[PDB]
Amino acid sequence: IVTQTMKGLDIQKVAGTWYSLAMAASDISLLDAQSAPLRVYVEELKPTPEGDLEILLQKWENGECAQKKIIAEKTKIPAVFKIDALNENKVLVLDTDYKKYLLFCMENQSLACQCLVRTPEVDDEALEKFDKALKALPMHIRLSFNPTQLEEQCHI
Amino acid sequence: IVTQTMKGLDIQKVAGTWYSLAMAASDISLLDAQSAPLRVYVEELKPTPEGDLEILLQKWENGECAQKKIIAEKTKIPAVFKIDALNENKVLVLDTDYKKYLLFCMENQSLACQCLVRTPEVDDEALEKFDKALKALPMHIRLSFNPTQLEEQCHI
Ligand SMILES: CCCCCCCCCCCCCCCC(=O)O
Ligand SMILES: CCCCCCCCCCCCCCCC(=O)O
């Protein structure tokens, strides 16, 4: 928890458009419902000059796919960020090649991880790396999305 | 779909108590909600003398974990059964060692598969066989349960 972070991460280089191709979580309840707590769909990453990371994502809330904006502040570790809210919340970058895929986990046990990809395409190779990275962890739900869903709001 | 069935299946030998240790499905919607269509928890298998298979399971329906009794009739293929209802529905036995684990899929595309085990224990070896069997298939949700859940009705 978690035993992989990426060495030599350049945060400025994860900038831009992402798709949440697959999500996994330690507890069924974290991803189960459409309004489930960690069931979130990444849209864009906006690294600040000071090295913080602004995240744009969608979440299903009322009975509606809602927009969100959250701030992840840098820590001393280049691959690890803290989310602004309660209580608190660590984001860890496990692996990325910047131009294709990015694996991250969010913890706080309580744990969810996603495979991000740059395009609305099923990347078998990034998915295989996501599954390799997660065999080490205690995940009890896993979801993956098809290209049609990846182009809809909240992957409907 | 599906490309593995078990050779030399003796149906009388799958008789008795089972636990649904892991479930996977082609479509998120088939397992997503607690009342989702293929979200079913196997309790016991009762093979008839004529080679049909009576299945006792639990399903979440009203706002309640309900009991069910379904009949799977034999076909010409020893590892494949047809479920009584609409419209219609094929059950295929992929692999079992009788005394520990049993892998099956239900189709009708539309596809769900489970890893059954004889005890409320996490069998890493049967799970690895379930994952091997499913790498071949187009699954978009996967769930697994812990021993505590396995001893509760509807794995709550
Ligand atoms: C490298 C960047 C990875 C992206 C990290 C995404 C972090 C998302 C964490 C959001 C937590 C849940 C937010 C839901 C807010 C709510 O409705 O309560
Ligand atoms: C070797 C035996 C494997 C066990 C096969 C279990 C088959 C279960 C299929 C049930 C289909 C869904 C039933 C729900 C009925 C409903 O509420 O509509």
Q: Which domains does chain B have, with CATH numbers?
A: 1-156 (2.40.128.20)
**Tokens 């904006």, residue located:** A69
Interchain pair B32, A28: CB under 8 A? no
Kindly give the number of the ligand 2 atom that is closest to the alpha carbon of B104: 3
Approach to solving: X-ray
Pairing of strands B16-17, B19-25: unpaired
| A72 contact partners, CB below 8 Å, separation of at least 6 | A52, A53, A54, A55, A81, A82, A83, A84, A91
Across the interface, of B28, B139, B143, the residue whose CB is closest to A28 is B143
B154–chain A Cβ distance below 8 A for any pair: no
Q: Which residues pair with B112 in a beta bridge?
A: B25, B106
Query: What resolution (Å)?
Result: 2.0
Q: Where are the alpha helices (DSSP H) in B14-143?
A: 28-31, 124-135
A125-154 b/e (C-beta count within 10 Å ≥ 16 → b):
ebbebbbebbeebebbbbbbbeeebbeeeb
**Tokens 């990325």, residue located:** A96
User: What ligand has the least distance to the C-alpha of B60?
Assistant: 2
Interchain pair A141, B141: CB under 8 A? yes
Two tokens, residue B26: 């082609």
Two tokens, residue B72: 């799977």
d(CA A90, CA A75): 10
Q: Confirm if A142 and B142 have CB atoms less than 8 A apart.
A: yes
DSSP reduced 3-state for B104: strand
Two tokens, residue B110: 């539309």
